[PDB]
Design a protein around this ligand. Sequence first.
Ligand SMILES: CC(C)(C)[C@H]1C(O)=C(C2=NS(=O)(=O)c3c(CNS(C)(=O)=O)cccc32)C(=O)N1Cc1ccc(F)c(Cl)c1
Length: 559
Amino acid sequence: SMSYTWTGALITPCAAEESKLPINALSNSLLRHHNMVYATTSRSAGLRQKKVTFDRLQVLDDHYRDVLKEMKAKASTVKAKLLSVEEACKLTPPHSAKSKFGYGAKDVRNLSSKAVNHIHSVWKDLLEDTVTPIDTTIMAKNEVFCVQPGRKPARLIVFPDLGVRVCEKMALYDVVSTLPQVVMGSSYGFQYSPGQRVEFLVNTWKSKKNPMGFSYDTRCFDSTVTENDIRVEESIYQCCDLAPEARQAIKSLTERLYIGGPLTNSKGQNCGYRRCRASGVLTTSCGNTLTCYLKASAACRAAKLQDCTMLVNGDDLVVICESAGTQEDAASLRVFTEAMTRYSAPPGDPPQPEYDLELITSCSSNVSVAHDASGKRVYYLTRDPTTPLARAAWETARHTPVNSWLGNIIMYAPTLWARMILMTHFFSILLAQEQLEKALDCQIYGACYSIEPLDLPQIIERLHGLSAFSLHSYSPGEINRVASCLRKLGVPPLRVWRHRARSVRARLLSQGGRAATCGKYLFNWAVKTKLKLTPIPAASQLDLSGWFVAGYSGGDIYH
Ligand SMILES: CC(C)(C)[C@H]1C(O)=C(C2=NS(=O)(=O)c3c(CNS(C)(=O)=O)cccc32)C(=O)N1Cc1ccc(F)c(Cl)c1
């Protein structure tokens, strides 16, 4: 069937949308080439609609059903619980979209009786009615990029009312938090810190006699998801040991929301109908991960890839296997792709075999190597810093709900671009505003986290190790990619950043306490006469539970 049917009604914004890079007094210290930076708006939604709208055909074979059976066997070992209304309410981001029924996120969060009453009413209706399609809003996402000589159209987000979103948590939060690791084991990617992911990638790579690897880019994964896939997902959820009410609600959410339903714009006009994955439901991450792992695991068998190890984060897939040499690897991957295509996950750009781990991009990241304090080689994950820096420029001039810069510093802390540019720039800004103590929101694996900037040294230590504060002798390939980015964007040379970082560090040191700790660890690279970095005390008090358990993209989750 068609992924979507459209009425002609337009996808509408809630507020005016800026597409041009806002400029303030801080902008130029980061980036001179402002016209290279843009944000998507709803006004390009028609271009997206076009490309996410196609017919899906699905041909399912024995490998498919075999893998599914294995997945269900493991799923049946999971026991999951219902969350109370209040438990589910506390998982709601403060900035979440408000209900059409006269209450908002903060009402939910502080448990107003108005919110809670509507929630209980939504739940009761889920138990009673397992057929009536549930309403969703379709919006365009405003995301920032750099011009790639041209522009990406806005992504679409499809989400049900707040009342329904709290109910999803009640029925499925424990499931989507617990099931994927039990079903998929070490192949489930959202369980890893950056440190663990690079560890798992390197160990996997060198466990092969002659390693070959490839990332598989599905063309618009969400759109490729069929009703079959979503019913198949539900059948996996139902293997779990669940309370009768959770079973009923899960069945009801599947039939009424997950499978499809009507699409309404912000003005309340009907825009059409969806028959593929909604990107803004609780099950998007878990559903996509299970479905990608199933199709890929079965496609590996069909292609006869040898010792194929998968790493799956939603729709993001990387496979590492044994080479049969270049001719056979190329033919293998074609069989893999034909299978995936038969399963309704055709590729965007065709996959290509890789023989160098560092040339493989997965979760928009590639492995690279640097050296630590004692010369002892260390692997870490990095990326082309263009988009992170284009977004950092936007966020320098505009207050954003989610600070991408903060998530990039957290996840890319060991990189030369994050240490030298992002750390230096934003700590300078926090200092000027005396907002070092001010807790800031960022999204990691789709979930929103409130973070104190001053806890960054502890956070980085836990996620990457001390190495992250002592890394040097980065690779010519990486150094060239950074330098090329700065040239393109008109970002000041690294000597300018080194100069600035010295100032930032000194200023932090002068401050004392946690701020001096930020000065010492984060900016030890800037000083020629290096200080000794010991393991950070009282770091092992702060619990990073909720971190690196599961993915929740589009799932309206707050920790
Ligand atoms: C915060 C950033 C930097 C953005 C982080 C992230 O949170 C993600 C992600 N967040 S997400 O939206 O949950 C996500 C998906 C979600 N896809 S889906 C709809 O659920 O099917 C897939 C891949 C990756 C993601 C990511 O790729 N990242 C890059 C990255 C990932 C893992 C690492 F170990 C390192 Cl070092 C860097």
